[PDB]
Amino acid sequence: DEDETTALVCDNGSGLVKAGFAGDDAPRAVFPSIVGRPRHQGVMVGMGQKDSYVGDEAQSKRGILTLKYPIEHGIITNWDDMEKIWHHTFYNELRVAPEEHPTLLTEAPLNPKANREKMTQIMFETFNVPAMYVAIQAVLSLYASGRTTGIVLDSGDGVTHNVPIYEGYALPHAIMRLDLAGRDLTDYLMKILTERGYSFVTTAEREIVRDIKEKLCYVALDFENEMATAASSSSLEKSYELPDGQVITIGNERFRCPETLFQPSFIGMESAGIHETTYNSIMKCDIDIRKDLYANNVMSGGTTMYPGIADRMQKEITALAPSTMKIKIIAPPERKYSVWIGGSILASLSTFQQMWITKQEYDEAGPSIVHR
Amino acid sequence: DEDETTALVCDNGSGLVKAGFAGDDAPRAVFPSIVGRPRHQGVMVGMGQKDSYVGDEAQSKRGILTLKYPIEHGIITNWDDMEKIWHHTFYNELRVAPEEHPTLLTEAPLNPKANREKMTQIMFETFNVPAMYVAIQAVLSLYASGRTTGIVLDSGDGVTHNVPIYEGYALPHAIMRLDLAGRDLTDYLMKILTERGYSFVTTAEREIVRDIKEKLCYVALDFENEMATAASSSSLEKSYELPDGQVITIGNERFRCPETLFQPSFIGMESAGIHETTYNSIMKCDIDIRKDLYANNVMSGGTTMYPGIADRMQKEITALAPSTMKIKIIAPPERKYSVWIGGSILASLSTFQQMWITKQEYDEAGPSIVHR
Amino acid sequence: DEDETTALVCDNGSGLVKAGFAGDDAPRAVFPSIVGRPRHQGVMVGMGQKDSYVGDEAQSKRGILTLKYPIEHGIITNWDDMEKIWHHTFYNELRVAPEEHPTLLTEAPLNPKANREKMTQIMFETFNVPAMYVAIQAVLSLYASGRTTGIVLDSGDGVTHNVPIYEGYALPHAIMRLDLAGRDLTDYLMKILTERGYSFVTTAEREIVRDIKEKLCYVALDFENEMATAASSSSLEKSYELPDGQVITIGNERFRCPETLFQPSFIGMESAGIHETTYNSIMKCDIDIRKDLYANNVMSGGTTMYPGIADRMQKEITALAPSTMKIKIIAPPERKYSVWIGGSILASLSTFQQMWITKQEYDEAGPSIVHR
Amino acid sequence: AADESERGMKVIESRAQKDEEKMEIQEIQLKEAKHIAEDADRKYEEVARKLVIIES
Amino acid sequence: AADESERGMKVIESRAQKDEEKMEIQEIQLKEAKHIAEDADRKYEEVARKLVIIES
């Protein structure tokens, strides 16, 4: 129990932090990855002067603060502001004292060696956690779907990745990163919806375009004869009621937004798209392992939640793969937390105890110890 | 000559229409983009009952009419009232019959496909012009400064834009629109001038604040130590004599008004300003084309006429751009008509004849034909 | 003179074409081996609609065209697009009419019999050249270094080869091909340089990583205690100034890039490396000829130009070869054109006239004639 | 051969710096001279138009 | 070391020529711009003096 209860799992994202206790089924804490700094001197009624704001209080009060994102494209870019988000996570969100909890953290696919050593330096030397561990994100997603070999298409708020994993070892030279994700996708909907003849003028109009994207957006299979369908004008249309009455209608654009993930050309991106990239990762791997990867395309991440994403991907890679092959696109329902759940499982596991980096290992080996 | 003489160029703005014959050096007709509708029944001496008023007669008689602006932020918002401004342009202002003149029109940067088809529907089907053509405004401004690749900062009465153009094709995904222009700017001067201890009480006081803005306003470089200069009180001050004697003095505010274009925060705008936006457009474009855009910042529009606008912009983007770069801010003297002049050149050109959309093309292809 | 002046030498590569007149000291024409096909309909100012683009106009205009490489790994893969590059070479680059010039062409090491017959079919039947000849590339490189027996390590843009040659006959069963060359090498530098904490974001950032590789990259001897040296941080570092000011520094990676040629494991390649492969070629040859090959390791190709390549290879094979042996690594300065120069010499030669395949031979013997 | 070519390099690099500085100081003196030429040539067309209207 | 220092010499000598040409073309464009700025600054001191007398 000492640490059975006690292991923490913190998944640091570009848009959201997911956090909680190893053992739980889902994150106890989910909140924006921002750190707000007040543009002016003054106070809220009853509070003192605050130097900084994090998560939702930074979002809610955004009009008087300069908002900053510590993690650009999955990599920690500002370490002063990240230690601020961690502090908030332990002390306010989970309300635990960190110096008696083992902490499993996550990093990104080709996270620079030096960063994995730096967050270890900050975990052990400024938070004084007993022990910690850094798992790679795609690797926890895979594992949370039971398996050990597969290829994960991972897509969240600032990055998309393909991480081919074989008997647990993520394959460095076959990993692909595509910098277009849910953030890019909300801003494109924004324009095709103002372009539908609308105005997201106040900040209460801006924010909810993102809630339109999440609730009403679709990834149609045969996106071709779906536009064609749009035109005959079926009961395909969908009206959403705004903060007030102002019933906005979205028929068609509803799927023009996730067609951006297959066609980056919709947004002036010259890069290849999700399905081709799944494939290219795969023809960059060893030959003998390619049947395995093909029957185990695990999807994780908030942006892979658009319904019919899996069917489109299913047919997208069948038709690029040699017919002798078995294609299989696994997309679980909890996928917006796969990464986290894979960490919860792993860290609550009976056999993981012997991989925890302890302060004994650290004080004796330097940050190098956990770096592997 | 048939049409060498005969091509018309009509530039539709948010505040002004500029019109005339391809060939001329400047617009034959310039007038407000209003359509007045009388609030009461009655007549002027010697005239009949008039249902409507357009341009200057609507401005002059504004006290008995409800004034309406057909073009909101560069886009045509009311098509009944726009066909009224066109009618006025052909028949009264240029006094031509439209059915024997080719007409080059202009549209805005990301003008909805459907509008370009609608004004074509109205040009050919209600005015019966022989042929017409719709050019994008920034694109005519660039071309009138000789070149084909550059980025235009275009700023008039209701909109500001940045339109990066490469070998003639305006780059859709890199275009930025900032809804703060000369209209916003006259109303801010208004307040900093009443705030100087004044009153623009009657309508003959209101209108002339705009003539103060045009004649006496400046964009200082080092707007910082220009306020500082204001305080030591040099012979920086400037008194204007009103419709009557009432000599009003404007020392300082003179430049506090165009500092609004770099600092939108002066007016409760949270958007970025002109120079940052020039830049952001540029780091949204292909990499290999960014040296070109930087050495070709062409300025056009009534609001970019404030003296010292170019020097401030020069230094504003040098200091944001990588030092390996050449910055070059072209601001010609005729810039309040760049757009129009670019159309005059192009439409009087020897090679343009083969791009005119003719009634033959239209009656045979539908509005789609000119839409491109 | 008839043909003393008149012989053409065209060396077709995976990345570059080298072309010119037999007699000259270096290629009159060097340009990319691409054929661009426009993604959209439209024109450049003053030109007509172009169906296709080749060489540098395809590279310069790459944003609106789909680029294609006719020669994959030294072998011609698309014959429609190759006839396009040849056409460009004769008519635009060298501006000659082909029907009065003998043409010496080059092919790759184990070029399929059928290809040598096909380019002969296209040379004689669609270009109508008087006579032609196909030399093997390593064989021209050797010969340009004076000799007739030696082993060439040939390395360009898409392939590396080892071609043991004895009294002029390249030895089929001892030839080795390693598909990792300068193209692979620019993309690896790219990643170790973004991994140094950088961004080659626009296309003007992408292209110049290749100019960094060419100018600043090194092949260190004792690559072991060169990394060790990197750490003590000597004045080994080297900063390059980008298209703009943005001074990028490259200390160390500078040599980590050509260490890829000895260690393919740096790039997820399981194949053996350059030096081992030199050697294996050699223990696949007759016994009595192995002292000859060892004292005549001739290097040719753009990717063998990295300084200190020869010293590393010198010591790489001394220490694998029996000590009774003399090792000798010849690397001339003009080596990026060895192949071409060997062709220029040979084809301008007094004795070569009797090996030219003439239209008389062809019209009478079929493509078989030149195939040998 | 190397020592003579290093010395010449050093001298032409020093001349190149010395002239690059002169260009930048003229190029800047000129954005100034051209800008004062243009602020001058506007003030006039306002004063000469103001003259033709108060003469009329 | 000699070949790299010869190549660098060649490139900095080429840049030094390329910039020396740019200076000369600006330096000349300027005797022109300054002279038109002065031919301008005399005739509106004349036209504004002519204005103040016909306004008076």
Residue numbers in the entry:
A (entry chain L), B (entry chain K), C (entry chain M): 1 to 372
D (entry chain B), E (entry chain A): 112 to 167
List passages from the publication reporting this PDB structure.
The conversion of the chemical energy of ATP into mechanical work by myosin involves coordinated changes in the actomyosin affinity and the orientation of myosin cross-bridges relative to the fiber axis. Differences in A-states and R-states predominately involve the configuration of a long cleft that divides the myosin MD into upper and lower 50 kDa subdomains, the so-called actin binding cleft. IFM also produces sustained isometric contractions at pCa <4.5, which we refer to as isometric high static tension or iso-HST, that correspond to an isometric tetanus in vertebrate muscle. Here we report a more detailed view of the rich variety of myosin head forms in the iso-HST state resulting from improvements in both data collection and analysis that have increased the resolution by 2.5× over the earlier work.
Column averages in the previous work had an axial resolution of 12.9 nm which is insufficient to reveal the helix of F-actin subunits; here the global average and all of the reassembled repeats show a zig-zag pattern of density characteristic of F-actin subunits indicating a resolution >5 nm. Significantly, we can now fit into the reconstruction an atomic model of the thin filament independent of any cross-bridge binding. We built into the global average of all repeats a single atomic model of the thin filament with 28/13 helical symmetry, containing 16 actin subunits, enough tropomyosin (TM) to cover the 16 actins, and four Tn complexes and then used that model for all the reassembled repeats. We estimate that the azimuthal fitting precision of the thin filament quasiatomic model is ±6°, which for a structure 8 nm in diameter gives a spatial uncertainty of ∼0.4 nm on the perimeter, assuming the actin filament behaves as a rigid body. Symmetrically placed about the target zone at the ends of the repeats are densities corresponding to Tn which show a 41.25 nm spacing on one side and 35.75 nm spacing on the other as predicted by the actin helical symmetry. The helical arrangement of actin subunits is now resolved, facilitating assignment of particular cross-bridge forms to specific actin subunits within the 38.7 nm repeat that spans from one Tn complex to the next. The present result, in which actin subunits and Tn's are resolved, and weak and strong binding attachments are distinguished, shows that the target zone comprises just two subunits on each actin strand, positioned exactly midway between two successive Tn's on that strand. The majority of heads, 78%, are bound to just four F-actin subunits, H–K, two on each side of the actin filament. The MD Cα backbone of weak binding bridges was not permitted to sterically clash with the TM backbone, which was in the high [Ca2+] closed position. However, strong binding heads inevitably clashed sterically with TM, consistent with their ability to increase activation of the thin filament by moving TM toward the open position.
